[PDB]
Design a protein around this ligand. Structure first.
Ligand SMILES: Nc1ncnc2c1ncn2[C@@H]1O[C@H](COP(=O)(O)O)[C@@H](OP(=O)(O)O)[C@H]1O
Ligand SMILES: O=[N+]([O-])c1ccc(O)cc1
Ligand SMILES: O=[N+]([O-])c1ccc(O)cc1
Length: 289
């Protein structure tokens, strides 16, 4: 299918995949349900990690139940519609409750039904420098994206917000502000790295679930990077090479915090930081790198 490497298309101010734009009315009119849990992230911030955690919670840590299908079918990417390939809206329409829904939409573009249904939302943020590195390699392997160009070209596009789903800065800031209006558990990738048990406990409390320590430990074990990277139900290796080419860069790439040090030159770092401070000083958000 000839659907790959196209230029992004503006949707309500945000660069999105051409086929999402083409099917935007279907996304806008998406029907949420009161018990939907929405996982909302800027790309490359821990979406798959948290989605697997949620599905594990819903299945009481049962690893085999969580291998019933690929993560992208268990937890549909709502707005992702590609002709001949996938339709997240239709996948969700046909899914029995309680649904786990994935989105990367900026808050201003989220289908209004989520607000009307007052859904609980788990937002995951990750430090910008690690995000852009992860996103660079992902652009290379995940062929729906436009060509990223060189690292320096891609870094500049990221800083300018000229990448799929728009600027990281506005995404994280506006979702942070939204936590005052709706029930949003706002998590950080770095915290999940440092103390995953603590973060899963936060998720459980938010979900109003109390589970045995033994089940919590099962969920912890199966959501580690070393397990997920080898799990074909979670590591995107069931995608066609034409869609995601693992040989270019694996989806489960490094799974650390601080990979930015391996990618950024000192000059790129200093420039990025100067720009970052200007963009983020209006926000009470604080990150670790
Ligand atoms: N269980 C886990 N623990 C830590 N990182 C994980 C993880 N599962 C996936 N990741 C990392 O999360 C990033 C992908 O995020 P998303 O799911 O939002 O696209 C990748 O980062 P890297 O490219 O830095 O390795 C990936 O390796
Ligand atoms: O075809 N693809 O590249 C896809 C399809 C589904 C999905 O959730 C993500 C990517
Ligand atoms: O383009 N893609 O195939 C994607 C993009 C984002 C994402 O979270 C998963 C797949």
């Amino acid at each position: 299918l000839d659907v790959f490497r196209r230029e992004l298309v503006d949707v309500e101010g945000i660069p999105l995949f051409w086929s999402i734009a083409e099917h935007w009315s279907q996304v806008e009119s998406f029907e949420a349900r009161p018990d939907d849990i929405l996982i909302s992230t800027y790309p490359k911030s821990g979406t798959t990690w948290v989605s697997e955690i949620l599905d594990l919670i819903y299945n009481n840590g049962d690893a085999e139940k969580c291998k019933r299908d690929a993560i992208y079918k268990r937890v549909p990417f709502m707005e992702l519609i590609i002709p001949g390939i996938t339709n997240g809206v239709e996948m969700l329409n046909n899914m029995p409750s309680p649904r786990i829904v994935k989105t990367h939409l900026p808050v201003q573009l989220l289908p209004s039904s989520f607000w009307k249904n007052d859904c609980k939302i788990i937002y995951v943020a990750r430090n910008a420098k690690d995000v852009v590195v992860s996103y660079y390699y992902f652009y290379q392997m995940a062929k729906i994206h436009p060509e990223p160009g060189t690292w320096e070209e891609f870094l500049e596009k990221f800083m300018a917000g000229q990448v799929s789903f728009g600027p990281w800065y506005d995404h994280v800031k506006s979702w942070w502000e939204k936590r005052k209006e709706y029930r949003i558990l706002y998590l950080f990738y770095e915290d999940m790295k440092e103390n995953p048990k603590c973060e899963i406990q936060k998720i459980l409390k938010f979900l109003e679930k109390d589970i045995p320590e033994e089940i919590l430990n099962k969920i912890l074990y199966h959501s580690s990077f070393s397990v997920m990277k080898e799990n074909p139900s979670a590591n995107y290796t069931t995608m066609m090479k034409e869609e995601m080419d693992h040989s270019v860069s694996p989806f489960m790439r490094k799974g650390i915090s601080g990979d930015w040090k391996n990618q950024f030159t000192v000059a790129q770092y200093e420039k990025f930081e100067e720009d970052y401070v200007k963009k983020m000083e209006d926000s009470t958000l604080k990150f670790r790198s």
